[PDB]
Amino acid sequence: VPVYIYSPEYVSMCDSLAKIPKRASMVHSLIEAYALHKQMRIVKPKVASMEDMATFHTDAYLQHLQKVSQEGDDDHPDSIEYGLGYDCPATEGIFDYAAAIGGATITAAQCLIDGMCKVAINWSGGWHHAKKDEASGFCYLNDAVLGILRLRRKFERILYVDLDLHHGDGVEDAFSFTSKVMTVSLHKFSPGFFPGTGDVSDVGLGKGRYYSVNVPIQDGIQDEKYYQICESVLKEVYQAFNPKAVVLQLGADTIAGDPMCSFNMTPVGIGKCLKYILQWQLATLILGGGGFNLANTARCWTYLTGVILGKTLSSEIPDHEFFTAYGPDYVLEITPSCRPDRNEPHRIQQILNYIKGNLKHV
């Protein structure tokens, strides 16, 4: 029975994140409206201690975030050094909101260590851009890294899979020098597109060389081709790396209708990737991430919660607090845009061949 990390107070904190106001409530509300919480073990998150957060983040960065968080000083002159500014404003309380999210992911990971469940979910986590000493890309603390470091207490090989629209650079950086954690990111890669890293030739460094995997993808990819790429890469990675636990980041900014308007995915395509990973029967930590069409992001993660539970959901959006956000059609399904797929099969094939060459060294 999957663990679902949730409390009303936790969701209320996550609702205050500057670039996604109210999204956590919308996601939880729709999950609850489909009664999926009744088939999961609800676990209240523990807040991360300063010591928890400092296993990855530097004391100087943590101290700055704490300082500007106290009153929401979005005009502190030292914020740009620590990555705060336009993408990451110093929202009042953000230090404590981030510690709550980091603690929730750590709590998920601890549930997995203890054998409480085989799947633990923190849909309000996944803030994969944050660096040891810098906020980045709407991420202030890197809860994914914190969750992986907690799993490292028990699991000697952790596979991180990152299906967000953006490259999971903060997680890849954290583990770039180690072979205990393999990071695998599928993302849009185009000069000028954030964060600008994650070409197929980026494979990690030192003892971690070939233990980072990047799949650079162009605008317009749809469900079938995405799943083909994902299954091909993950098949090779599973055989080469033999993970004992998986952390899966499922940012919904890939989904048709997102204002970023880059990929052209539906939750069905992501759900097939998720099913492939669940079939490994490993301890699996499930995280959210990006997603800036808020109703579509709730649709996606609600559908994926159903996939985790093996449950087929009704097309009709049930009545709930945010029902009117789903109009005028009020259905769960998302329809792809009619715009071109810029991914040429020959380029995708060469990327896959390059990755297979990389993974022979593993």
Partner: peptide, 5 residues
């Protein structure tokens, strides 16, 4: 340093 956003 890129902008996201």
């Amino acid at each position: 340093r890129h902008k996201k956003x």
